[PDB]
Amino acid sequence: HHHGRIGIPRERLTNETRVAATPKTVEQLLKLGFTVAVESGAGQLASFDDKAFVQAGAEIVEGNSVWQSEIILKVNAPLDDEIALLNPGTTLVSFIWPAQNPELMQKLAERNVTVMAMDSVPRISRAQSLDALSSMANIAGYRAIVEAAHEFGRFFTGQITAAGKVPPAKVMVIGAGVAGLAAIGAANSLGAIVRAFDTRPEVKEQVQSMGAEFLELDMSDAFIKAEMELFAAQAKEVDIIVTTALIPGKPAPKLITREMVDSMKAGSVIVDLAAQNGGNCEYTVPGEIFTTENGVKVIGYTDLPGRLPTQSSQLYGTNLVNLLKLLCKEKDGNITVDFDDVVIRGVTVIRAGEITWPAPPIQV
Amino acid sequence: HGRIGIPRERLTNETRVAATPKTVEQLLKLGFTVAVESGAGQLASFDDKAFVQAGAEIVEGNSVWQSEIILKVNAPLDDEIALLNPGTTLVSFIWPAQNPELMQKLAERNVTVMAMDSVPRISRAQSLDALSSMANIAGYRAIVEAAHEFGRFFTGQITAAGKVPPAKVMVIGAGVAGLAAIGAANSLGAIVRAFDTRPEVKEQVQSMGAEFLELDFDGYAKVMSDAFIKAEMELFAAQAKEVDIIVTTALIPGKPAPKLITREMVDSMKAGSVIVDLAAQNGGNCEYTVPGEIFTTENGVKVIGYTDLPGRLPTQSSQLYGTNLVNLLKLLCKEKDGNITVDFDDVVIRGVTVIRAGEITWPAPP
Numbered sequence A: 001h002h003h004g005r006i007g008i009p010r011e012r013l014t015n016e017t018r019v020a021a022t023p024k025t026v027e028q029l030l031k032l033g034f035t036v037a038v039e040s041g042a043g044q045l046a047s048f049d050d051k052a053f054v055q056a057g058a059e060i061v062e063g064n065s066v067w068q069s070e071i072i073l074k075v076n077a078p079l080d081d082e083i084a085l086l087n088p089g090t091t092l093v094s095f096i097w098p099a100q101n102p103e104l105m106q107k108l109a110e111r112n113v114t115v116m117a118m119d120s121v122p123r124i125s126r127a128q129s130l131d132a133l134s135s136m137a138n139i140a141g142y143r144a145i146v147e148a149a150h151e152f153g154r155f156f157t158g159q160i161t162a163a164g165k166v167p168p169a170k171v172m173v174i175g176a177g178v179a180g181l182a183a184i185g186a187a188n189s190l191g192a193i194v195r196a197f198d199t200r201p202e203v204k205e206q207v208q209s210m211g212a213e214f215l216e217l218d219m220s221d222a223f224i225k226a227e228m229e230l231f232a233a234q235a236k237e238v239d240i241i242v243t244t245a246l247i248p249g250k251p252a253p254k255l256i257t258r259e260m261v262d263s264m265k266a267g268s269v270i271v272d273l274a275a276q277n278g279g280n281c282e283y284t285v286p287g288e289i290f291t292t293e294n295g296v297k298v299i300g301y302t303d304l305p306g307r308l309p310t311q312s313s314q315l316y317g318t319n320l321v322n323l324l325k326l327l328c329k330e331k332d333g334n335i336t337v338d339f340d341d342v343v344i345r346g347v348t349v350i351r352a353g354e355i356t357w358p359a360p361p362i363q364v
Numbered sequence B: 001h002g003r004i005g006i007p008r009e010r011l012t013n014e015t016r017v018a019a020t021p022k023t024v025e026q027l028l029k030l031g032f033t034v035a036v037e038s039g040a041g042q043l044a045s046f047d048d049k050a051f052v053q054a055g056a057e058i059v060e061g062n063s064v065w066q067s068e069i070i071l072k073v074n075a076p077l078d079d080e081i082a083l084l085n086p087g088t089t090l091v092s093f094i095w096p097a098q099n100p101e102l103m104q105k106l107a108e109r110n111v112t113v114m115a116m117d118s119v120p121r122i123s124r125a126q127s128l129d130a131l132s133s134m135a136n137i138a139g140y141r142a143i144v145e146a147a148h149e150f151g152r153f154f155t156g157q158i159t160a161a162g163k164v165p166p167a168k169v170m171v172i173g174a175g176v177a178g179l180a181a182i183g184a185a186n187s188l189g190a191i192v193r194a195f196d197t198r199p200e201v202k203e204q205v206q207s208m209g210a211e212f213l214e215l216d217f218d219g220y221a222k223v224m225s226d227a228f229i230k231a232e233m234e235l236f237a238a239q240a241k242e243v244d245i246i247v248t249t250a251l252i253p254g255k256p257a258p259k260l261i262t263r264e265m266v267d268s269m270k271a272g273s274v275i276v277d278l279a280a281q282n283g284g285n286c287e288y289t290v291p292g293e294i295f296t297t298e299n300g301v302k303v304i305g306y307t308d309l310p311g312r313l314p315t316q317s318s319q320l321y322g323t324n325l326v327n328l329l330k331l332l333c334k335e336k337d338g339n340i341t342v343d344f345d346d347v348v349i350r351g352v353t354v355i356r357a358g359e360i361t362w363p364a365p366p
């Protein structure tokens, strides 16, 4: 028996580099009164070796041995042959995406387990410390710029050289949510001249506070036309475009057309952070870099957080710790679900074998 | 005529070009005409039409070699040497000391050759110093390469998912490349540390935000003694245990690079550290380095030993290098004339000129 033990399995999803705990989060989990079993090699792709987990106080296990834990933390939802190894009474925490996965939901319910979906955390301010989506979008903004710099053939950073002045790169960020603000931030660190647009005017003051230009137009379309004319104008002026625009519950809006890209200066780069939802850019090939005929690199990776695995695992694993701080107020290795707390109600999609998703309507 | 020819570089995998549209404008103001071989700027993102806009003529195949002046990045390959016609002035990297066969073959064609690697490393020549331009780019690019391979934030920050410390960066060697690396790592918010055996650079390193590392301890003899070398190795072993990124730049042309970071030191680093070895072309300052590749150690260190860092910033390298050439030419062509005077009283021209009218004139006097 393994009450109060958390099992951290190796991620089985193709090309996943992240892990749901790091040596550091493990020290934190033990402070909450749990024990931790990590499956051998779980952290290798994220640069956390077996020995560092053992040094943090975890036990390395080999088999399905990790599944004999009372609690399982993962990045991705379990596959069929994992689901069958979940014992009754187990609490599983991972990304689930219940709306897009009704059969997964039924198979978990049948194991008589509790499930909290890290995608279903309500976006209220007190829940920010558990919000994995913000965590990942933040990494992705940062990484977007790291990829852009990697692919770009000029200095990002302005500079006085004996062989001439070099101007700074000009970067347009589309969407100044969590990812777009991270991208602004990264680009600023490299000394770029940054411009941003968002439809939500309330971000104006954060964007300008970062030394970036908040772009203005000349809603509900024909607002789109003035937005597209802005992006067409900007596309001929800038070197780098980072596009991050999603609308909850929809495909990704085409904001950057083939004609906009075609007008850009050769050697320009586009990082399309909405690629997994189809991309903001018409040239985007999800999963790849596409190079246009005029010499523009369109970056469409769908795994920017997995291209920064150590940092992603750290922050995600902190998200899970912070969720467990809610569930284990006494620090005694025991989980208590409180449906009066709207945060816990949001996140809990199965409770001991009963589907509890969707949560009652909330005001975010 | 006074025509300058810019060939496409044919050394396998070369991405740089000896002129950009911007430098072609400048070439013309000096009284020259310019032909660019089609496709020459492509890999550096300058297509034919961008060269024509600038006032250059596009030509195909070997017509480019029928110019009074040839500007290249790399030395002519074997089937390019024959294409040099007598009285032509060639300007490129040559590395005479390390290629006497090349030097003989060029001499027969009865050309004048100027090796960009032979520019006297002095005050009045820094606007012409291609080795400096290329090192500066390489230092900056090293850190882009480090960031690409690194699995953590470079930049400290505070998220609701917690506080992330900055990356810690050690730069070995604070010449041109090392300082460029210090600057890019500091821009990214790292804690940057730097060692150089020359104490004069301390204030330079410090002014850019970096800690100047001191040893637990004439100058030439001090730096070669067993005692100093044991103390320097000791410093590196200790830093390797605590930093995330090491950039090594200790490289002398034609000499094999000193092994400053041993297998043992790398084996002590935190998993996911990155080493960028800018001495890889001469064997590397790190014992794990595999020149031309990234090598991953058993303990999860990425040892980056690409030898072509300026060609992984091709647009920038072509722009600056082409500007160095423009500047050589301003010095060869004082009356903005279309005509070149190889004035041997100017020490910089004396230094760069390694063949003249078929006579090997390298090496220049002290």
Ligand SMILES: NC(=O)c1ccc[n+]([C@@H]2O[C@H](COP(=O)([O-])OP(=O)(O)OC[C@H]3O[C@@H](n4cnc5c(N)ncnc54)[C@H](O)[C@@H]3O)[C@@H](O)[C@H]2O)c1
Pocket (backbone or CB within 6 Å): A123, A124, A125, A128, A134, A137, A174, A175, A176, A177, A178, A179, A180, A197, A198, A199, A200, A227, A244, A245, A246, A247, A248, A253, A255, A364
């Ligand atoms: N309370 C908090 O402390 C907090 C913190 C972070 C996020 N959140 C919440 O999470 C939710 C989503 O997070 P997000 O802000 O990263 O958004 P997001 O990821 O859905 O999209 C990124 C940005 O794209 C923008 N966008 C959409 N269409 C656009 C268009 N056509 N042109 C330009 N921009 C466009 C959005 O307005 C948004 O700012 C929001 O409800 C937010 O309030 C809350």
